[PDB]
Design a protein around this ligand. Structure first.
Ligand SMILES: [Cl-]
Ligand SMILES: [Zn+2]
Length: 258
């Protein structure tokens, strides 16, 4: 009985193995755009992904991750609400069975078709595993996807998904440029929160971009052909791998824009 997204092991069950599921700084949340406070002290984000080195793509049974070489300061995020330099380690997505759901964060209760997470860790802590134990250990860039026109920069990703259909499969995935996934504007909301999968550690500064990117219906359809299960086991389609919005409790969402 490992956690997942089904009826018997899904997010409303996670608290039994991970009591921090009911904590004070759980993610994701609904971003109420009228209640978010403009904070003119927030700096622009600085995303330096020109030297990024992708290595590999892996189906880990909950999502697919694209992994980057984080042994040096090659793809980093700084600025915004952050102090110091955060290195990119992986990205992944959450998506739905239908185009009207899939995102983890919502905006005035609006759900998007999917959500991209670019996960970065604070270099002062030396490695990813030490970083997840700290309140300012991680910074996740969240980007909403809506269905419309195709995103050329994502096509490379969707074309290898056939080679990692089932849990545990990996494939070489070099020379992928994550700059092709960014929107035009870098305006954002930010709030302190958590990983949205177990172990749900409260170590994340969330930076959620206001402007979604567009993907085509055909592109998101290929995500939905992946499997939660391993090879040879009964087929369960990897769909609806998103955690519902959690209570904001004592937190303020700040916006970089008015
Ligand atoms: Cl993971
Ligand atoms: Zn995620």
């Amino acid at each position: 009985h490992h956690w997942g997204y089904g009826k018997h092991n899904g997010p409303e069950h996670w608290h039994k193995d991970f009591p921090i599921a009911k904590g004070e700084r759980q993610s994701p949340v609904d971003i109420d755009t009228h209640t978010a406070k403009y904070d003119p002290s927030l700096k622009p984000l600085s995303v330096s992904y020109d030297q990024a080195t992708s290595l590999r793509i892996l189906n880990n049974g909950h999502a697919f991750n694209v992994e980057f070489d984080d042994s040096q300061d090659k793809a980093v995020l700084k600025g915004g609400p952050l102090d110091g330099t955060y290195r990119l380690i992986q990205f992944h997505f959450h998506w739905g069975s239908l185009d009207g759901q899939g995102s983890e964060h919502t905006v005035d209760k609006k759900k998007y078709a999917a959500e991209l997470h670019l996960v970065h860790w604070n270099t002062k802590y030396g490695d990813f595993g030490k970083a997840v134990q700290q309140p300012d250990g991680l910074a996740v860039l969240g980007i909403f996807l809506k269905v419309g026109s195709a995103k050329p920069g994502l096509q490379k990703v969707v074309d290898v998904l056939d080679s990692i259909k089932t849990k545990g499969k990996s494939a070489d995935f070099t020379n992928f440029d994550p700059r092709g996934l960014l929107p035009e504007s870098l305006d954002y909301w930010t709030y302190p929160g958590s990983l949205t999968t177990p172990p749900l550690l409260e170590c994340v500064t969330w930076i959620v971009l206001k402007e979604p990117i567009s993907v085509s219906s055909e592109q998101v359809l290929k995500f939905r052909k992946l499997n939660f299960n391993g090879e040879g086991e009964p087929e369960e389609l990897m769909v609806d791998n998103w955690r519902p919005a959690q209570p904001l409790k004592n937190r303020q969402i700040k916006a970089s824009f008015k």
